[PDB]
A paper describes a structure:
Envelope glycoprotein (Env) trimers derived from the BG505 genotype are the basis of many current HIV vaccine development efforts. When expressed as ectodomain constructs stabilized with SOSIP mutations, trimers based on this clade A sequence can be readily produced at high yields while preserving the native-like, pre-fusion conformation targeted by known broadly neutralizing antibodies (bnAbs).
To explore the effects of nanoparticle presentation of BG505 SOSIP trimers on the epitope specificities of vaccine-elicited antibodies, we used the computationally designed tetrahedral nanoparticle scaffold T33-3154,55. Analysis using cryoEM showed that nanoparticles assembled as expected with eight flexibly linked trimer antigens on their surface (top row). Consistent with the structural data, biolayer interferometry (BLI) experiments demonstrated that the antibody binding profiles of BG505 SOSIP fused to each nanoparticle were equivalent to those of free trimers. However, reduced binding to antibodies targeting epitopes in the middle/lower part of the trimer such as the fusion peptide (PGT151, VRC34, and ACS202), gp120–gp41 interface (35O22), gp41–gp41 interface (3BC315), and the trimer base (RM19R and RM20A3) was observed in the context of the assembled nanoparticles. While nanoparticle display did not improve the overall levels of NAb responses, it had a dramatic effect on the epitopes targeted and angles of approach of elicited antibodies, particularly after early immunizations.
Numbering used by the authors:
A (entry chain G), B (entry chain X), C (entry chain E), D (entry chain I), E (entry chain K), F (entry chain C), ...: 1 to 118
J (entry chain J), K (entry chain F), L (entry chain N): 1 to 104
Write the structure that this text describes.
Amino acid sequence: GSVRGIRGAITVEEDTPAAILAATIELLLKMLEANGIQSYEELAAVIFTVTEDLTSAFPAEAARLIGMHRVPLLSAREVPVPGSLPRVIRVLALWNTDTPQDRVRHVYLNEAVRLRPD
Amino acid sequence: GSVRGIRGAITVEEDTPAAILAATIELLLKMLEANGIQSYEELAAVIFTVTEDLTSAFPAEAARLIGMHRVPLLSAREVPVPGSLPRVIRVLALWNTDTPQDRVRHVYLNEAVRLRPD
Amino acid sequence: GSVRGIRGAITVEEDTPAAILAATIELLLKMLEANGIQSYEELAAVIFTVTEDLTSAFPAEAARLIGMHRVPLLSAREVPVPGSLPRVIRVLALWNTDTPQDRVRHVYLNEAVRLRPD
Amino acid sequence: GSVRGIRGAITVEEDTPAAILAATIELLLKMLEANGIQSYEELAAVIFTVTEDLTSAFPAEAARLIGMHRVPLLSAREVPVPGSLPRVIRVLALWNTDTPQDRVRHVYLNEAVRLRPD
Amino acid sequence: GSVRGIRGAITVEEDTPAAILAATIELLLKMLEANGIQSYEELAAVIFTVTEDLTSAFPAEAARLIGMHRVPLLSAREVPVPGSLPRVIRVLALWNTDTPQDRVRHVYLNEAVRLRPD
Amino acid sequence: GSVRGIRGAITVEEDTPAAILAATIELLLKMLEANGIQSYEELAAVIFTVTEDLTSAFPAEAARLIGMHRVPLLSAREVPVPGSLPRVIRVLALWNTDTPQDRVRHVYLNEAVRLRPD
Amino acid sequence: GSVRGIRGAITVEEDTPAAILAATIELLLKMLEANGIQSYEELAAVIFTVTEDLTSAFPAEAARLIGMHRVPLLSAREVPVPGSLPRVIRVLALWNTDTPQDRVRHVYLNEAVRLRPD
Amino acid sequence: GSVRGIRGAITVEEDTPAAILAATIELLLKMLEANGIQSYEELAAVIFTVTEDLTSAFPAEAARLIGMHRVPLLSAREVPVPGSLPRVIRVLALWNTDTPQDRVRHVYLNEAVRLRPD
Amino acid sequence: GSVRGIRGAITVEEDTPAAILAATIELLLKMLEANGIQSYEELAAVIFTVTEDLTSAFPAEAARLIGMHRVPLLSAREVPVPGSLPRVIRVLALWNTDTPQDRVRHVYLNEAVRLRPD
Amino acid sequence: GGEEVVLITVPSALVAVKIAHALVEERLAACVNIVPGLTSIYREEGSVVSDHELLLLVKTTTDAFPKLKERVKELHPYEVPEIVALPIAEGNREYLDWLRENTG
Amino acid sequence: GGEEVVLITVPSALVAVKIAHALVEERLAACVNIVPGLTSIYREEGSVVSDHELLLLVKTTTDAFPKLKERVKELHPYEVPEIVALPIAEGNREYLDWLRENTG
Amino acid sequence: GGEEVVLITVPSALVAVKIAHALVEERLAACVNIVPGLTSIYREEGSVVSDHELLLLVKTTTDAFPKLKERVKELHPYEVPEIVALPIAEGNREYLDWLRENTG
């Protein structure tokens, strides 16, 4: 096996802990479904980043609501480039798979679709 | 082999370079001991993050005091969620092992024990 | 195969989008050349970080100018330690190789050479 | 005759005096052409407003480059509602015409088209 | 016909978009009823101003909820004179009527009654 | 009849309520005298704007000291363009007259004369 | 011989290093020409001061472009009195001459002429 | 002859232009009287400095009220060391005399007496 | 005799009163030794300037620890040009000597050597 | 072909826009680029002085140049405007056809 | 000698860098200078409009120009890219030799 | 007429001013415009690298060019300064007369 990163992003409308957690769950589960991941045992790590305007909650907490208790979770704050899409939660997961790079699916939700690399 | 992240965290009482470096060493060595790592050759990379209140030193510098000269070291600043534990240094190491996900030990020191995922 | 991180850094003289993008390209291409990487298929992920004084552009955008369309790209903001080298772009790439840790070359450009771990 | 307001808006990419003046001219002339105004004698007044991020020049100055020397010109700063379109110059002209309200054309240029009342 | 301005004002208790929009509607409709205006065709323009403490919404948006789609709408921010009544929305409408100046009714609602010119 | 705007401006030396009110009176009366206005019945509305450095009083209050009780009065804050003339009070009056545009006189007092469109 | 100070001042339009250096050269050379100084050997010292709005360069650097390598150069920041002329570079040179006080010429350039003690 | 500096200082109770100018005059005249200076022809230059809390006027202006029209006058802002005496105006004059260093008198007025080097 | 300025500079690592005073003494004594000054009677004046980051003490106080009780001492704050050497204490002394300009030695200590005019 | 790039130096944004707009509007130019923020060192009278200035790059043709010179002199606040034309050796054919279509 | 300076006008930093990098990397240019912050007034369709733009100054040669034009058309997001070459009359000999060595 | 515009690329404001001042002061140029803020992508050794740079536009004449080249080489901190002259096809007559009066 090798390692492939999986990326995705979701936006929220407000900095409310419930919204952050709910959005984080939606994104994490969608990423895992897209790539057929039925177990968290395949994840080496997950890194979450957020924009400067979301400070009421940590997305990493949502990960433990869906059972990723043993997956290392790290988070960081993003660079505030003017003109960027506001209120964005981004996730990079490191997946221990044999899937080719071009067969890994990435997930962009809500307004994050505009930043999809297509 | 595959890749497993190793996590840990430590807190300090003040933003003093000596405290940061000393704490970083304690945490890194403890993580490596916990998982039986006798060589830095097994580490793909180490990512350090800190809270917004620790700016007097870079934890990555401590890593070179214990000889991790060839281990890629990256660092980033954490999201300032109100109510979070202050003065926290967190580390994610990426370990090139064949160890199962649930056999990787994580290390939480000082007041960081309250944030341990147990 | 296993995973080895590749590190490098470059500095710029001003926070101008063109300078950021140009510098990012120079650094990414130099890292890849140094390690003989002829394809982006070998990269699990790339993480970019920048100092607090570079906010006009995202280095990750440069990566798509050189064709890294399928490489997961994540970015974060660095810890503002006083006395640090200003205007620095740092990159950590995760490379799915069988190259020994001590055979991976790292790249430091412009004023970033002063922070090279030598 | 009666009075009908004429509205329009234009956006600029940066707060550069040349851009502001050039954009203001484009918008004013386009408004006048749209409504068939061949003389400034028909304008009772023109009111310009700008967003909080455009402070390098006064749009009213542009009006005198196109000869509106005798048209009363007033300007004001807009309410900074979060999420609003940035760098917007808006103009309200008061036209002494007999044109029905629904026969007055309004002009939205560049990114201001998204805020057109259609 | 000639032109007469119509003035009114309303206060709100909090900077909540719903409150702003609801208050704006109440005020606009009341102004129009007070003066017997059965059609928006008689309005040359409407200018809205708000105090510095109301930034969550634009009062002009409310105007389109009551159908003033063709009425030119402009808005601006008020001068923050200390001691002034907080959270105030003020409206000036320009009405193409033959009504004498002293027969035009003005509307002051909620706490704005204290600033009525009587 | 039709509508013609009347413009004028005056500067003050300090942000003292008495100075603002006194200056406002001087300017309003001078504008009305210049254009031969013997009655406030001819004014559709008056709009006052001030620079960012005058916050101790509202110019509109002065208008009621000279009896403009039935004239709609609106006020707004000006755009802080660097290099602009400080402490300026500007007035736009909308006059329901049959006077040609080029026969309407405008008034610039004190240091505001430097900004007269001549 | 005795000591006479020589004063002068110049303004710039923007805080651009090139403008500062160019302006500084113009002023220094003009001061020296005005007083017939053919050598820097006669200067005991030169003190430069600038207003609070010029921070992109040190005027003292310009002095070494015109060869004043051995002239002691000191610089300081000026008192920000409101209403003062913006973007001003002032120079005091101490000249070891036998020239009477009233035969020493002072130089004021660009907008600094308005502050000349005449 | 040679050059001797003359120092003195005075404090004021408030940042009022009249107080600054009056205090500056008192200090300058007292310094000159103390040292027997009957003419300004003997002064090479005068340097004024003020604390960070006096910004309403330039002490140098006072110098021209007492006739020092040909004396080069330079001014600068002082270092805000916590605990320092507030509202202090300090003057250094450079006097072209043959007076021994220990025969030059210095003047400290009002609360500045506490900082006299005795 | 004539007047020659003497310059020098020293840096400190932190804004600690003891460090400032100690550094100031080292620099002043070194300047005097370099130029053979055995007495303070030859100094017309000394002017100290510091960067914006040193506010815990006045360098002038150090001068009285080495006995310069009768030497006029003035101090000022430096212009904060970005990229400048931090924590710098600079001194200009005015020396009543017959020494040629090119025989006066200047002193640069610690990191200030990088700014020496050589 | 006769296509040219004219460099006009102007003292301020108002002048830069006023001229640039007039030349394009009147078809003396197809396109004008304004480059802000210049520092200008030049000889004036007996010495060397500095100024600010902006630079206009005007994409025009040689046959319209005589008209351009007169129009710029009328608008530009100097006794001696700085107007110089640099020739175009070659270029994108569609672009050059475009300049001619929009000039004159 | 045939050395030329090509002016290419681009809408954004991403385009400016993408093109500049491609031309140098592919040896269609030895050096590209990017001048940011332009204001562009030009005739479009039936009127005069403004845009932002950046300017690229490409130091190349005439023989590589045909290739440059095609490569720029492929990368530049316009129907009609603005690509014009101004000739070099003379220059630093070592520099000009350098441009030729690095171009083609 | 022989009037020319010389493009000189410099690494910093100190160099830009030092050269611009020297050329005008010494009458090797009548006017120098400094355009700040460039981004430079160029081939160096075996790869493509970037730098900052400023651009000087020097209004001079061909006969003074040989002197200019030598003076710039003396002041400019490079083995190979980038100095290229673009010809002036035509221009404001008074301006061109002025350049000649002030050059040489």
